Amino acid sequence: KYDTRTLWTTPDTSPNCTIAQDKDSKLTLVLTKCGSQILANVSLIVVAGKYHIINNKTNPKIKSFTIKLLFNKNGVLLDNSNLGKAYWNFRSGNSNVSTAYEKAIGFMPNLVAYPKPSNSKKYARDIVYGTIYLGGKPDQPAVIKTTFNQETGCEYSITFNFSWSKTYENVEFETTSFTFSYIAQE
Amino acid sequence: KYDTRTLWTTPDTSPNCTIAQDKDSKLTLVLTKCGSQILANVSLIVVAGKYHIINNKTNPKIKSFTIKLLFNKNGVLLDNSNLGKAYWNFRSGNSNVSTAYEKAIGFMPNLVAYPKPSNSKKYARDIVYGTIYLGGKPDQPAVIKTTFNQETGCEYSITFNFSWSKTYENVEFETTSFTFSYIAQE
Amino acid sequence: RTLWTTPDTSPNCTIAQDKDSKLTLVLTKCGSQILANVSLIVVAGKYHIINNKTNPKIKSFTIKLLFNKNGVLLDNSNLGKAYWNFRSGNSNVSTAYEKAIGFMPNLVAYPKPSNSKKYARDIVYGTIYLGGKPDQPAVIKTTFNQETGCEYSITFNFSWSKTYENVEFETTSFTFSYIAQE
Numbered sequence: 001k002y003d004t005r006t007l008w009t010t011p012d013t014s015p016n017c018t019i020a021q022d023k024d025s026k027l028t029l030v031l032t033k034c035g036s037q038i039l040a041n042v043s044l045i046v047v048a049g050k051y052h053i054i055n056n057k058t059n060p061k062i063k064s065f066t067i068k069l070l071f072n073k074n075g076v077l078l079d080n081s082n083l084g085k086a087y088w089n090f091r092s093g094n095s096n097v098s099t100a101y102e103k104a105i106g107f108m109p110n111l112v113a114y115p116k117p118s119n120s121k122k123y124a125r126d127i128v129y130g131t132i133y134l135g136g137k138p139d140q141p142a143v144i145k146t147t148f149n150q151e152t153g154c155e156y157s158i159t160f161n162f163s164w165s166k167t168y169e170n171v172e173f174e175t176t177s178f179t180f181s182y183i184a185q186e
Numbered sequence: 187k188y189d190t191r192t193l194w195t196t197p198d199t200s201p202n203c204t205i206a207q208d209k210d211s212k213l214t215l216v217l218t219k220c221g222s223q224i225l226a227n228v229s230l231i232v233v234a235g236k237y238h239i240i241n242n243k244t245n246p247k248i249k250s251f252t253i254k255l256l257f258n259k260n261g262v263l264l265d266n267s268n269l270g271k272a273y274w275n276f277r278s279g280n281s282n283v284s285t286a287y288e289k290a291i292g293f294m295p296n297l298v299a300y301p302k303p304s305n306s307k308k309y310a311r312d313i314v315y316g317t318i319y320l321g322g323k324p325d326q327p328a329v330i331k332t333t334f335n336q337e338t339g340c341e342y343s344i345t346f347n348f349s350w351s352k353t354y355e356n357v358e359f360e361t362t363s364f365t366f367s368y369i370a371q372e
Numbered sequence: 373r374t375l376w377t378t379p380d381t382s383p384n385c386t387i388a389q390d391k392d393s394k395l396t397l398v399l400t401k402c403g404s405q406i407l408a409n410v411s412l413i414v415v416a417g418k419y420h421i422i423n424n425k426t427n428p429k430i431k432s433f434t435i436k437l438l439f440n441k442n443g444v445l446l447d448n449s450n451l452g453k454a455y456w457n458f459r460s461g462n463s464n465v466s467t468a469y470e471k472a473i474g475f476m477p478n479l480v481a482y483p484k485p486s487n488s489k490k491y492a493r494d495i496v497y498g499t500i501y502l503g504g505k506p507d508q509p510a511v512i513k514t515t516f517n518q519e520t521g522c523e524y525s526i527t528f529n530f531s532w533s534k535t536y537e538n539v540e541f542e543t544t545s546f547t548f549s550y551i552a553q554e
């Protein structure tokens with residue numbers, strides 16, 4: 001059956017995301033609608049390019065990057081997002097429904113909770129911080145900062161900024177999972 | 187909506203909470219019922235009075251404060267709570283249903299999991315800890331400690347204690363969001 | 373919709389000796405994701421009172437839940453089967469469940485051990501606090517489907533790095549989620 005309460009990337013490892021080069025990563029993102037809140041589960045695997053293997057010995061200034069999901073007024077993912085549109089859809093089993101969705105407003109971050117930009121200092125409640133671990137190692141933390149509706153050129157957005165303090169020496173950027181939630185638009 | 191699965195403060199910024207003076211803050215709290223667990227999402231904006239701008243040079247020992255939600259046997263908010271009664275109801279759209287609810291036991295913290303204070307041994311599982319960030323700045327952590335059913339003068343309670351260890355100088359007390367869950371009474 | 377240990381404090385888990393602990397675990401199915409809430413009370417034995425001045429090398433322990441093709445708990449799990457069932461009130465359904473595959477950790481998200489690249493996404497880390505004291509953290513590492521001799525697994529490793537002196541191992545609560553098998 002069509003799982004109309006889940007919007008996801010599918011849980012496979014095929015690259016679906018472009019951070020620095022085309023399809024250099026798998027963002028695994030599952031949004032499950034529990035009424036007024038979306039329960040969100042996220043991880044990242046970088047498979048190629050600039051962020052695949054971190055070396056802060058050779059490149060000490062490379063300490064963060066950003067993955068943006070931008071949505072229009074109907075909750076449809078915009079082309080300029082880092083996440084590709086071909087496997088972002090409602091769930092069917094371990095895959096997606098066949099028809100590209102036309103409406104997902106119920107999965108969008110609430111605009112009264114998280115107003116869009118701006119020319120307006122905004123309240124911090126539109127941010128959630130967490131920590132994930134590279135390679136599952138407990139001494140390899142990175143910060144995942146999630147921000148709602150702070151991108152311009154869209155109606156809604158979810159942004160993930162990944163950052164770290166440690167001087168990583170050939171560490172592959174693939175992460176443990178993090179769960180959060182946010183208030184839904186409808 | 188008439189969303190009988192969500193009890194909330196609404197997502198607006200109208201001050202609804204009294205910490206040190208009348209309506210000096212907006213507590214944004216959303217309780218969403220996923221069967222036997224309540225999914226909770228919380229943030230705080232202090233808009234005026236003593237806790238609005240922290241200055242620990244002027245006030246070295248102001249390092250914490252508490253917001254309490256106290257409930258009767260039917261799950262109805264009691265007026266000694268810091269959150270105002272007019273701001274707390276079942277969801278309708280971005281607003282509240284027009285008349286106060288009579289029962290919300292399904293939203294109350296489970297008394298077997300989290301007993302009221304008594305002569306019996308108190309267990310730590312009635313607490314959840316998280317860290318939120320003032321102004322969304324990653325060097326401005328504060329701890330949110332949430333405690334279930336540990337107030338007297340009520341049948342159920344949810345208490346939020348906000349505290350910090352750093353010496354903050356002119357830092358605005360408005361927070362990022364935190365998600366947690368707890369076991370429901372019914 | 374809810375698989376759980378019941379929320380009472382009667383011991384149901386064997387870490388170092390028979391029924392030395394109460395694992396309170398609640399798994400609620402929100403569709404494609406399981407919402408999980410976990411805490412631990414150790415009541416007796418080696419892990420009840422931590423004293424790292426006396427015993428410097430007692431710094432971690434593991435609790436394993438092993439499941440077969442049907443989502444049924446295998447009896448070599450640390451958690452006892454008598455206690456683990458679908459909710460009815462504050463107790464359990466009268467009969468033992470035959471099926472809960474919809475509560476199992478998804479095997480494409482979280483594959484069993486293999487001879488291919490092993491990804492970290494099958495781990496969730498959190499911190500809980502012993503005695504509810506903010507200066508007594510311990511790490512709770514949760515891992516999906518990485519045990520052998522089972523179809524599915526959930527494992528909780530508890531560890532700490534501070535030198536605790538006479539600290540009772542009873543934790544605050546931690547919530548996490550994971551992608552469901554179906």
Ligand SMILES: CC(=O)N[C@H]1[C@H]([C@H](O)[C@H](O)CO)O[C@@](OCCn2cc(CN(Cc3cn(CCO[C@]4(C(=O)O)C[C@H](O)[C@@H](NC(C)=O)[C@H]([C@H](O)[C@H](O)CO)O4)nn3)Cc3cn(CCO[C@]4(C(=O)O)C[C@H](O)[C@@H](NC(C)=O)[C@H]([C@H](O)[C@H](O)CO)O4)nn3)nn2)(C(=O)O)C[C@@H]1O
Pocket residue numbers: 129131133138139140141143165315316317324325326327329351497499506507508509511533
């Ligand atoms: C409830 C609660 O929160 N309790 C905490 C209490 C409590 O606040 C007080 O007791 C009051 O009640 O405090 C604990 O800490 C006591 C204080 N303490 C002692 C130490 C040793 N060092 C020192 C240190 C300090 N800094 C400051 C920079 O840090 C921040 C900041 O700017 O303030 C913290 C922010 O949260 C962070 N922001 C974000 C968004 O993340 C920022 C940010 O990153 C930067 O600003 C950049 O923008 O930074 N730095 N050092 C702290 C310390 C401890 N270690 C041990 C080794 O570290 C790790 C590791 O990397 O290996 C961390 C890792 O996450 C962890 N892994 C896991 C899975 O948990 C591992 C692991 O435990 C071991 O490796 C074993 O495998 O350890 N290094 N440096 N710091 N603070 C307390 O009382 O114990 C903590 C308690 O939770």
Ligand SMILES: [Cl-]
Pocket residue numbers: 270271272273
């Ligand atoms: Cl009022």
Ligand SMILES: [Mg+2]
Pocket residue numbers: 035036106184185186
């Ligand atoms: Mg909705």
Ligand SMILES: [Mg+2]
Pocket residue numbers: 505507
């Ligand atoms: Mg102490």
Ligand SMILES: [Mg+2]
Pocket residue numbers: 403404474552553554
């Ligand atoms: Mg299912």
Ligand SMILES: [Zn+2]
Pocket residue numbers: 046047048052172
């Ligand atoms: Zn790689």
Ligand SMILES: [Zn+2]
Pocket residue numbers: 079
């Ligand atoms: Zn297009």
Ligand SMILES: [Zn+2]
Pocket residue numbers: 137139
């Ligand atoms: Zn290491």
Ligand SMILES: [Zn+2]
Pocket residue numbers: 358
């Ligand atoms: Zn302000």
Ligand SMILES: [Zn+2]
Pocket residue numbers: 233238
């Ligand atoms: Zn001001």
Ligand SMILES: [Zn+2]
Pocket residue numbers: 323325
């Ligand atoms: Zn600063």
Ligand SMILES: [Zn+2]
Pocket residue numbers: 414415420540
């Ligand atoms: Zn004890």
